[PDB]
């Protein structure tokens, strides 16, 4: 009975990990940050509304210049907007109308999309002669694509629904490194600011911290009750916030290797579909199934205002690298730029 | 502004091209096809003529799109909301697997799948077209095998008319909501016609109920 010995060993080893994490819990963020004054009420007004989509919007991503953004919808189109003047730079028709993710290259020459077809398609925006055309179809995943992020102009990391995250090579088209260890579907991921580590929330109510180069998991975080729908990375790079299906936001610390604060209110029971930080990391914007977007004080776990301008569920949310705007797509085929 | 006013009329030529292709998709009927792998979806697909397979066929100047998601093998609750809005769900169940097992017999695993799909929070007004394939072999099997293997509580003669009717009413029992949706059961043989016409009739009842919703009668 080697399995019984191995199973008992894991439980004994897990107890040591829990004891070590609790041994360093000298205080809490709420107790430490009692002194700091509240940020006060925040008023955000819809400065622009982008129209043109004829179906639900499942993903969006700001450009690195904080002016152009790409929105993916299940009407079969991938629209690139000019957020300053509401113009439409491009409208890319997809081969598969079931798209649940979108990405924008840091250089700006490429965009990516994926969905129920288990294929991540890279589109060339440079278009040396003509229009935007497909540059590569990265096949090899077993489940649906849930998130994709551009590490550089040649490397893209994708998380699929078959419990595996992958690192690709756009120029060649092969799986450079495969990340395994999850038990449920991987629903989201977030790259570090320095692009060396990335987290990945999964349906097994756990988030893991991977290493891009070596390809091995480093730290595993627990504490949620249901699936982790979305995840985001702190601007400093030593923390990350996750949003789960039981109406709660949790902030974890990489160095402390334990949960720091939780953002829950008894009046909210709707799940969370997106999280994102402000430029300074003080705010924590989160989207909900109750058609509303809430702004949380990260250092005080206090609600600081709501962004209610949508008539359906909020599915995607992002903050520009400039930090001067927030865009909130939703299922009613509308995008809104707040403040 | 000379190179800026020219960037606006390009945003307007893109705008009208989205409406032209957006009106085309409104004149199309989207159907979701489910099953238990070997239930007979392949047989049905040929009758009307990795990832998600889209099948296109037309009937009486009406365009049908039929998506199969039986090759996903993931958590259904995560991507099943993408199909919220289909006209009807074409459910295929094989009558010849009432005794075959994968443990659990193959007919019970279809009932469990049917229960989740029928009583899902996203599919409220979506009509379900339940097809019962493999009727030819099912008739022969009950002669030498008893239906009590699948349903112990069953008590009746081992006749095709009695056995088939008992199975059909067992599936409609699982529908907890008997007033918000209707199940159009049907019997399909290996070599049969008019199957596509049955789907056409079940979709028309959804279009009429959709049209009355626009005016206000519904």
């Amino acid at each position: 009975s080697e399995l019984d010995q191995l199973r008992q060993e894991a439980e004994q080893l897990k107890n040591q990990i829990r004891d070590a994490r609790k041994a360093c819990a000298d205080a809490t963020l709420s107790q430490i940050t009692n002194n700091i004054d509240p940020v006060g009420r925040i008023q955000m007004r819809t400065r622009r509304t982008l129209r043109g989509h004829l179906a639900k919007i499942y993903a969006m991503h700001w450009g690195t210049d904080s002016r152009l953004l790409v929105s993916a919808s299940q009407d079969g189109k991938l629209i690139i907007w000019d957020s300053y003047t509401t113009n439409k730079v491009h409208a890319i028709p997809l081969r598969s109308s079931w798209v649940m993710t979108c990405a924008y290259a840091p250089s700006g020459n490429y965009v990516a999309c994926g969905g129920l077809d288990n294929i991540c398609s890279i589109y060339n925006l440079k278009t040396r002669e003509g229009n935007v055309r497909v540059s590569r179809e990265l096949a090899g995943h077993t489940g649906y694509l849930s998130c994709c992020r551009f590490l550089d102009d040649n490397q893209i990391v994708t998380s699929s629904g078959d419990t595996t995250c992958a690192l690709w090579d756009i120029e060649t088209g092969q799986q450079t490194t495969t990340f395994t260890g999850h038990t449920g579907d991987v629903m989201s991921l977030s790259l570090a600011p320095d692009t060396r580590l990335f987290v990945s929330g999964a349906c097994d109510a756990s988030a893991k911290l991977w290493d891009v180069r070596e390809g091995m998991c480093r730290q595993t975080f627990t504490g949620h009750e249901s699936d982790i729908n979305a995840i985001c990375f702190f601007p400093n790079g030593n923390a990350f916030a996750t949003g789960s299906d039981d109406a709660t936001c949790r902030l974890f610390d990489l160095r402390a290797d334990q949960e720091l604060m939780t953002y829950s209110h008894d009046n909210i029971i709707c799940g969370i579909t997106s999280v994102s930080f402000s430029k300074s990391g003080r705010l924590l914007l989160a989207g909900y199934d109750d058609f509303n977007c809430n702004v949380w004080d990260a250092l005080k776990a206090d609600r600081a205002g709501v962004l209610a301008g949508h008539d359906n569920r909020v599915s995607c949310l992002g903050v520009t690298d400039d930090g001067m705007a927030v865009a909130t797509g939703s299922w009613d085929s509308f995008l809104k730029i707040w403040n | 502004s000379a190179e800026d006013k020219a960037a606006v009329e390009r945003s307007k030529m893109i705008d009208r091209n989205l409406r032209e292709d957006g009106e085309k998709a409104a004149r199309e009927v989207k159907l979701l096809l489910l099953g238990a792998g070997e239930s007979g979806k392949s047989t049905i697909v040929k009758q009307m003529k990795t990832g998600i397979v889209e099948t296109h066929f037309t009937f009486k100047d009406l365009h049908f799109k039929m998506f199969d998601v039986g090759a996903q093998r993931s958590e259904r609750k995560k991507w099943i909301h993408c199909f919220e809005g289909v006209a009807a769900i074409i459910f295929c169940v094989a009558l010849s697997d009432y005794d075959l097992v994968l443990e659990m017999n193959r007919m019970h695993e279809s009932m469990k799948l049917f229960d989740s799909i029928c009583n899902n929070k996203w599919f409220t007004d979506t009509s379900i077209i339940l097809f019962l394939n493999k009727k030819d072999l099912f008739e022969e099997k009950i002669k030498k095998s008893p239906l009590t293997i699948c349903y112990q509580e069953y008590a009746g003669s081992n006749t095709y008319e009695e056995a088939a009717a008992y199975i059909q009413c067992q599936f409609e029992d699982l529908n907890k909501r008997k007033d918000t949706k209707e199940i159009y059961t049907h019997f399909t043989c290996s070599t049969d016609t008019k199957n596509v016409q049955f789907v056409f009739d079940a979709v028309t009842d959804v279009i009429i109920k959709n049209n009355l919703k626009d005016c206000g009668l519904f």
Epitope: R67, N87, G130 | S1, A6, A7, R10
Partner: single-chain antibody
Framework: VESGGGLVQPGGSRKLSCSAS????????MHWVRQAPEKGLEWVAY????????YYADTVKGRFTISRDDPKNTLFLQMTSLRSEDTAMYYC??????????????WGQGTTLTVSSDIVMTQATSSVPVTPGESVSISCRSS???????????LYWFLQRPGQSPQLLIY???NLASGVPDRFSGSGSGTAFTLTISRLEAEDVGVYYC?????????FGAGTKL
């Protein structure tokens, strides 16, 4: 690529045709810039994408007529009444307009035919020593400020090697066109603009033109031979 055109004729009428080749002609606005046998370039006409806005030069407002046909990828220019002034070499130029686009990127081979207010660009310098291996700066001036409210100054720099069609080096104030080596640079202030070359090579010999894109009756700058 693109080529095609007519021939010479005495005081009559003729049709000019340009044939696109594999660059999605249906989404490109096309111009009909023309160049005199010895003088500089001069704008003639323009037709947008989808045959929307159409503009004409002051001297060819009524005599000329432009048209396009996205099927078969052909651009048409109809000329009815021709005087002794309209004898020149006619170029076809493509241009696409969005936020980060680079208009006037590709120029046609060009055809010649003989018959037998606005913003003016100064470009005072007209001759520079041909000595290579050093840095040469080309300056230009405009009648009115080319800086717009949005914040970008519309000024394009073209290079015309002797024998070939003009090529675009710098679109707008400083952005460098694709396929152009990094020795070219552009700095300006809204009315005064300069072009800088770091290391002159044998391939940089030619005539450098300027162009404005603020008001559509646009004008060139008579060139500057090196």
């Amino acid at each position: 690529v693109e080529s095609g055109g007519g021939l010479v004729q005495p005081g009559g009428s003729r049709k000019l045709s340009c044939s696109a080749s594999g660059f999605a002609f249906s989404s490109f606005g096309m111009h009909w810039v023309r160049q005199a046998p010895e003088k500089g370039l001069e704008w003639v006409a323009y037709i947008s994408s989808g045959s929307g806005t159409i503009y004409y030069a002051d001297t060819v407002k009524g005599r000329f007529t432009i048209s396009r046909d996205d099927p078969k990828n052909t651009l048409f220019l109809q000329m009815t009444s021709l005087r002794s002034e309209d004898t020149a070499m006619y170029y076809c130029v493509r241009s696409i307009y969005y936020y980060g686009s680079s208009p006037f990127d590709f120029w046609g081979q060009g055809t010649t035919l003989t018959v037998s207010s606005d913003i003016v660009m100064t470009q005072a310098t007209s001759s520079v020593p041909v000595t290579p291996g050093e840095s040469v700066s080309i300056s230009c001036r405009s009648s009115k400020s080319l800086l717009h409210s949005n914040g970008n100054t519309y000024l394009y720099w073209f290079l015309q090697r002797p024998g070939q069609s003009p090529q675009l080096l710098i679109y707008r104030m400083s952005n460098l066109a694709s396929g152009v080596p990094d020795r070219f640079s552009g700095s300006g202030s809204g009315t005064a603009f300069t072009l800088t070359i770091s290391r002159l090579e044998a391939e940089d010999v030619g005539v450098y033109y300027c162009m404005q894109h603020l008001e559509y009756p646009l004008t060139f700058g008579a060139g500057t031979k090196l």
